Amino acid sequence: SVYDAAAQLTADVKKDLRDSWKVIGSDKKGNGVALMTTLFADNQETIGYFKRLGDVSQGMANDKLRGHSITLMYALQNFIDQLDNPDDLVCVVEKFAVNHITRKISAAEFGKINGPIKKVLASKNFGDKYANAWAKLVAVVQAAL
Amino acid sequence: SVYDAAAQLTADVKKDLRDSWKVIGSDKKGNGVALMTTLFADNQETIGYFKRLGDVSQGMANDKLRGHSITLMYALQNFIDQLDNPDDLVCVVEKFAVNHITRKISAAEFGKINGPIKKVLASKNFGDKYANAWAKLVAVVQAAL
Numbered sequence: 625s626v627y628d629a630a631a632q633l634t635a636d637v638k639k640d641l642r643d644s645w646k647v648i649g650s651d652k653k654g655n656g657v658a659l660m661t662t663l664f665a666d667n668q669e670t671i672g673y674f675k676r677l678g679d680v681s682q683g684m685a686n687d688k689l690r691g692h693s694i695t696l697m698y699a700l701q702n703f704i705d706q707l708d709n710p711d712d713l714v715c716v717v718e719k720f721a722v723n724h725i726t727r728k729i730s731a732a733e734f735g736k737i738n739g740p741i742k743k744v745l746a747s748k749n750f751g752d753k754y755a756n757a758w759a760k761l762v763a764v765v766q767a768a769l
Numbered sequence: 770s771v772y773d774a775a776a777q778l779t780a781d782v783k784k785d786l787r788d789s790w791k792v793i794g795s796d797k798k799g800n801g802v803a804l805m806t807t808l809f810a811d812n813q814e815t816i817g818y819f820k821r822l823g824d825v826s827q828g829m830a831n832d833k834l835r836g837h838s839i840t841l842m843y844a845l846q847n848f849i850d851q852l853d854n855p856d857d858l859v860c861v862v863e864k865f866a867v868n869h870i871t872r873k874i875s876a877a878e879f880g881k882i883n884g885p886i887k888k889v890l891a892s893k894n895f896g897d898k899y900a901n902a903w904a905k906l907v908a909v910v911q912a913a914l
């Protein structure tokens with residue numbers, strides 16, 4: 625249940641999400657591309673889903689990948705901004721879930737983003753505590769897939 | 770080209786876009802839904818394109834419409850944030866253009882949003898100068914359609 629998952633976002637979890645986002649969200653282009661390139665490097669089996677973006681190995685040099693990556697960071701910005709109101713968080717999460725259901729992405733495969741998130745956070749000196757908080761947010765999307 | 774349309778956005782136009790967005794963008798849920806409801810009220814022929822959202826006459830109560838409307842405002846946020854780097858603006862604009870090209874939305878049809886934009890701006894006392902500034906930003910996306 626997406627509603628039960630959203631209820632898992634306690635005061636402490638919301639605080640950790642906001643605190644780490646202040647840093648990570650300050651460079652959407654840089655960290656967004658870093659997140660995607662890490663996903664492709666660690667889970668090569670997901671590259672097929674991204675055929676529209678072309679040669680993802682080009683990273684920042686690939687205009688489609690850059691546009692996609694920046695936009696992905698605004699979806700996370702959206703989630704963070706809706707933390708105060710569970711009903712609004714749920715409706716935006718369901719909107720993005722549809723974007724992935726149409727691409728045949730399961731909850732299990734969506735969860736593969738947790739590895740990359742932990743690595744990007746770690747590179748900015750945010751440890752397991754923060755990675756776990758972000759995993760709880762990712763779990764809200766998983767509940768809708 | 771799209772780059773040409775973007776590179777033409779002057780310092781004054783960017784200033785007007787940012788000043789009006791400071792206000793309109795501060796209430797994404799309220800102004801996003803107002804923008805969509807105004808589009809449906811004045812251009813009823815577009816209602817059919819949004820069949821996925823269900824009964825759009827339900828307004829704020831419609832969770833799918835609310836989720837869509839909030840997300841639309843973050844696409845605008847994205848554009849505003851990329852104003853000083855035409856290369857980044859172009860790649861995000863092309864990304865969103867694809868979202869509309871796949872739905873068979875023409876450049877002329879996309880321009881129908883200018884009426885609702887003018888009205889929403891007017892509700893916050895932003896006049897014709899501001900409506901003209903926004904029409905120039907919309908024109909950047911039209912260059913990609």
Ligand code: HEM
Binds near residue numbers: 673676
């Ligand atoms: C933090 C997690 C993630 C977020 C917030 C996210 C967000 C997004 C957004 C905003 C889009 C654009 C939607 C559209 O315009 O249609 C997108 C597209 C896509 N996402 Fe994700 N995504 C995430 C993780 C994943 C993962 C882990 C996979 C795959 C295992 C995935 C697969 C896709 C695919 C295939 C597309 C379509 C790309 C294209 O053809 O343009 N996403 N995602």
Ligand code: HEM
Binds near residue numbers: 815
């Ligand atoms: C202010 C300009 C506009 C912006 C910011 C914009 C942005 C968006 C965004 C972010 C999406 C979601 C894309 C996706 O996830 O697949 C969307 C979907 C869509 N847009 Fe727009 N749009 C604009 C104007 C228009 C206009 C004028 C029309 C039609 C005359 C239009 C028709 C559509 C349709 C049919 C969808 C698909 C809705 C659905 O089934 O989920 N858009 N738009």
